[PDB]
């Protein structure tokens, strides 16, 4: 089934009456406004394109403005697409709200993880550090060997090395839905989700269940 | 640690393909003195956005 686009508000706890603390992530899910419906005949597949939030009228270009005007909806801060199953249908201009998840109890949350910059092999790939003492020469956190010898004669593609870490799209699967609060546009899921505070989150019903 | 063959002059100019400088091409004009200056910078005569600021 489709999902909704929200933003990571932060993280807190919920105390249950039987003395259990549930670490929850607070996701603010405003109304998602359908801006385009893609169908098999015209686009080759079935999906809806949604928008959410708001954007400053000076920051929206007339290409984007014209695209929004065709749907007859207000400008949002972006556009996302959701693949449609066989059953459901939607109409352009329709708004979808958080009570979509009223009876779901597992979600998959996708976001852009925090960017770690250029990271070494110890941090990025959990490589073991070498000896801190006992004669070690300038080689406390270096990767060590990277290949065999003349017989391969090259470094194998996909070798684990230092480089960019984080700042990439990550999905976390099968999160408990703790609370759906329609009037506050809030969704509370158990556990941590990728991304820093204030970043966009894509919430979908769990695919594996 | 060191080359096995002398690189050609071709590879030299191919590396310097990215070393070219870029001109500013965007001088602003003060509304009072009419002087040219860098955008968001004091003019040589001490004006900024039409106001005498240094002297």
């Amino acid at each position: 089934m489709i999902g909704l686009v929200g933003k990571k508000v932060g993280m807190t706890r919920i105390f249950t009456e039987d003395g259990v603390s549930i670490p929850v992530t607070v996701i603010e899910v405003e109304a998602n406004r359908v801006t385009q419906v893609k169908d098999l005949a015209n686009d080759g597949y079935r999906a809806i394109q949604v928008t959410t939030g708001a954007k400053k009228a000076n920051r929206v270009t007339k290409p984007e403005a014209g695209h929004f005007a065709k749907a007859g909806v207000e400008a949002g801060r972006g556009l996302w697409e959701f693949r449609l199953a066989e059953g459901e249908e939607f109409t352009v201009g329709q708004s979808i709200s958080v009570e979509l998840f009223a009876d779901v109890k597992k979600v998959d949350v996708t976001g852009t993880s925090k960017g770690k910059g250029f990271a070494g092999t110890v941090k990025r790939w959990n490589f073991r550090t070498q000896d801190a003492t006992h004669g070690n020469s300038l080689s406390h956190r270096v990767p060590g060997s990277i290949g065999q010898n003349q017989t391969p004669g090259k470094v194998f593609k996909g070798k684990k090395m230092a480089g960019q870490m984080g700042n990439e799209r990550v999905t976390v699967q099968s999160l408990d839905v703790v609370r759906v609060d329609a009037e506050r546009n809030l969704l509370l899921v158990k556990g941590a989700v990728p991304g820093a505070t204030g970043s966009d989150l894509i919430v979908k019903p769990a695919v594996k269940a | 640690a060191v080359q096995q063959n002398k690189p050609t002059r071709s590879k030299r100019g191919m590396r310097r393909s990215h070393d070219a400088l870029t001109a500013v091409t965007s001088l602003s004009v003060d509304k009072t003195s009419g002087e040219k200056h860098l955008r968001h910078h004091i003019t040589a005569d001490g004006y900024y956005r039409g106001r005498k600021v240094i002297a």
């Binding site: 925090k114 | 004091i42 240094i54």
Partner: protein, 120 residues
């Protein structure tokens, strides 16, 4: 990583930054306009403006704090006697930074920082 951290270290250790900014704040107070690198300004503000805020209200304790931050009695006197009264109704933002080119010796980006009044 540097997430949400604040404060340039300016290729200096802590005590040297503290001393340099104390001296520079004294200079700005006595002269009301000085010329430094653009990165040293934008850090002077975070030092000098709190002293003016402190000087808006005059008391023995506040003068002692100002003297602790800038160990110069002339600077404390001028602060509490002129700059506090001059900026009594100003809600922050007592300084201006004006980019003014590049330094001949090392091509460092220069800037002028001044108090917004300077008796104009």
């Amino acid at each position: 990583m540097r997430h949400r951290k604040s404060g340039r270290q300016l290729n200096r250790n802590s005590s040297h930054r503290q001393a340099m900014f104390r001296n520079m704040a004294g200079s700005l107070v006595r002269h009301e306009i000085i010329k430094t690198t653009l990165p040293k300004a934008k850090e002077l503000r975070r030092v000098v403006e709190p002293l003016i805020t402190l000087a808006k209200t005059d008391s023995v304790a506040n003068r002692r704090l100002a003297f602790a931050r800038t160990r110069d009695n002339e600077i404390v006197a001028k602060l509490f006697n002129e700059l506090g009264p001059r900026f009594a109704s100003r809600a922050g933002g007592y300084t201006r930074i004006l980019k003014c080119g590049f330094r001949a010796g090392d091509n460092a980006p220069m800037a002028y920082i001044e108090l917004v009044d300077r008796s104009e």
